[PDB]
UniProtKB/TrEMBL annotation:
Residues 18-258 form the Protein kinase domain. It comes from Homo sapiens (Human). The lineage of its organism: Eukaryota, Metazoa, Chordata, Craniata, Vertebrata. ATP binds at V24, G25, A26, G27, E28, F29, G30, E31, V32, K50. The active site is at D143. The gene is EPHA3. It is found in: Cell membrane. This is Ephrin type-A receptor 3. Receptor tyrosine kinase which binds promiscuously membrane-bound ephrin family ligands residing on adjacent cells, leading to contact-dependent bidirectional signaling into neighboring cells. The signaling pathway downstream of the receptor is referred to as forward signaling while the signaling pathway downstream of the ephrin ligand is referred to as reverse signaling. Highly promiscuous for ephrin-A ligands it binds preferentially EFNA5. Upon activation by EFNA5 regulates cell-cell adhesion, cytoskeletal organization and cell migration.
Length: 273
């Protein structure tokens, strides 16, 4: 079980063991970079590093480290791993799993139509597995989107980041956030992946995204989308949250498609469903 919140769930790292190799850019609370971490066993691994800006407010420190207090509760191959934090020296740091290929949406946009359907299904299965664990822990993510999934050198996708286009109708209507609203979001991620990082609902007015979805309109099948995967999207997007599949069912559906890849050969403006 997830507990709503830092040293209970995060290792305090010795800064001597951290080296910075590359500055990536600015983040919400400070800089973002990558480098190397020397583990207690002397093994050296690549890591993502983010720092808290100099002259931070106490609120900024709390919100920054709050990420680590959440992330550190999870240990799963499809959830970004927290290596630890540095708080006893400044700048304050959060050190996480290095993901060579960055955010999934931007990665797929660079590779439009360049992966096999089985490669894409593997990415999607990883995301679903991570979400099955999060939901098993009672954690509702509320921001599940391809931009919040990171992808490593071997194309393994992992949930990271601990709005309207990704949010279920009931969560928009009255803030009813449940694991079933995360399943809705997963359906949107599924569309994002099969579309190679197209923006869900493009740049439709937010009011129109809300109204169209409420009226029963759904995102159309991506080009060359397997029927099985478009149906899975529609199932994730059921108006009645009780009729959406559970994450365990989504994982099982994708596993069957991986086991029977011939199934993917059956191929399927908003569409009224």
């Amino acid at each position: 079980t997830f507990v709503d919140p830092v040293h209970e769930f995060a290792k305090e790292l010795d800064a001597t063991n951290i080296s910075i190799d590359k500055v990536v850019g600015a983040g919400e609370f400070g800089e973002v970079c990558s480098g190397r971490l020397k583990l207690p066993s002397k093994k050296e691994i690549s890591v993502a590093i983010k720092t808290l800006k100099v002259g931070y407010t106490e609120k900024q420190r709390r919100d920054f480290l709050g990420e680590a207090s959440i992330m550190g509760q999870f240990d799963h191959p499809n959830i970004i791993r927290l290596e630890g934090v540095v708080t006893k020296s400044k700048p304050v740091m959060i050190v996480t799993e290095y993901m060579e290929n960055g955010s999934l949406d931007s990665f797929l946009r660079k590779h439009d139509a360049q992966f096999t359907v089985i490669q894409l299904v593997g990415m999607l299965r990883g995301i679903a597995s991570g979400m099955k664990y999060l939901s098993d822990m009672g954690f509702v993510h509320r921001d599940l989107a391809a931009r919040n999934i990171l992808i490593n050198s071997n194309l393994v996708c992992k949930v990271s980041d601990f709005p309207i286009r990704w949010t279920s109708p009931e969560a928009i209507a009255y803030r009813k956030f449940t694991s079933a609203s995360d399943v809705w979001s997963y359906g949107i991620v599924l569309w994002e992946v099969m579309s190679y990082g197209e923006r869900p609902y493009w740049e439709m007015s937010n009011q129109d995204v809300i109204k169209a979805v409420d009226e029963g309109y759904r995102l159309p099948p991506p080009m060359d989308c397997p029927a099985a995967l478009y149906q899975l999207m529609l199932d994730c997007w059921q108006k009645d949250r009780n009729n959406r599949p559970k994450f365990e069912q989504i994982v099982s559906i994708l596993d069957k498609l991986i086991r029977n890849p011939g199934s993917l050969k059956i191929i399927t403006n908003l569409l009224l469903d």
